[PDB]
Amino acid sequence: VKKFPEGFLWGVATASYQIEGSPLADGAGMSIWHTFSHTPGNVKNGDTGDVACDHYNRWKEDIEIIEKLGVKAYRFSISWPRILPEGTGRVNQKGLDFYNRIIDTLLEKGITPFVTIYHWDLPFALQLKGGWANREIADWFAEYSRVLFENFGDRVKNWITLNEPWVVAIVGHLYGVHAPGMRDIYVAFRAVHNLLRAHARAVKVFRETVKDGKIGIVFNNGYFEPASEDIRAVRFMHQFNNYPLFLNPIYRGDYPELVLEFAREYLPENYKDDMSEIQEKIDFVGLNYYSGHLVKFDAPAKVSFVERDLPKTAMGWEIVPEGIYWILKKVKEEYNPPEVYITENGAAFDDVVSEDGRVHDQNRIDYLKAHIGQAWKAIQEGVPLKGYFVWSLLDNFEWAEGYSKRFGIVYVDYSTQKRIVKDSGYWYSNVVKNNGLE
Ligand SMILES: OC[C@H]1CN[C@H](O)[C@@H](O)[C@@H]1O
Known about the structure:
Glyco_hydro_1_AS, TIM Barrel, carbohydrate metabolism, binds (2R,3S,4R,5R)-5-(hydroxymethyl)piperidine-2,3,4-triol, 16% strand, Glyco_hydro_1, polysaccharide degradation
């Protein structure tokens, strides 16, 4: 058996735009994902977050599912434009009401809320003023964060400033695949820097407003292996694509060496002037992890991926469970944060409801079991892993892939909004109840 420490936090995770629908209900302002998905050509099949899982209406049922499964923590995000429809200034009480009911319900049921302040649904009003490209977003984000802390910090004690700021910056502003759909490398690196500045101002506000809680930040991470002996190409991908891009500034006061070699010209001229503020102390690091990549020197960043004959998910992502052990070891070794969480881990497979009314996702069980086992390993070797969150509770709007990719441990029939707990959800409930694997 593999038992986890007493009090280890087993959770599930979602994000507001991916599950809620009703993006303009009850006085909410448009987000950049509303306007991006409503632009033809940006999302597969023309899918949008208009309805999604209708969590805006079905939230109680969904939390009752979390409760029924015995899951101990729920990581969810707040829609900024539901709270401040123009991004700054006016606060929308109906938006606060929506999350207040979710928080109170979770607490009543003994489930720990972990709140992601920003999971990509920037108010459209702020995008008109440059969004993450504008230095002033450090202020806008601090004002937003302060509203959340003032209204919710009496009850929510676990906070995440940003989800996957690399994706926000690079996929949103260089690749143009995500909102706001731009392709400018100078804008993309300004966004990196402003994400750090905004993250740090929010932590600063947090210390002033929620004197008894904890706050951290969440990064996407891949396991990059070298194709041969381009072991530097691996070094660059780690430093650029993984936690170092942000943690080197937070813990060491500068970007990683190979990031600076690639991107110095694209950063503001006097970017170091902001580093002392960026070092604002954080309480934990959240790492997301899905996939490994074989990398060789080559390509726009002098790096290309090499395909491998390994099992893959429906995303085409190679399944490399040891990657989660590696990234956990590596973060301790490099920055030694006081606490770590796996804030997302999961897989998309082509789920089908069998004639027996069940979803027999053995592929997903195998994926999660392998990764949980590797996380356990990291714990045995001294990594202060405090929790593990499965992405996701529900099949949902998977960004530019729309509804075509299902990551839930609960199946959603979008024609009816019926929820069907998958075999993986049942399996996970047992893991949680047992506090580990058997
Ligand atoms: O692509 C799967 C997930 C990757 N991480 C993001 O936080 C989440 O929103 C995505 O659905």
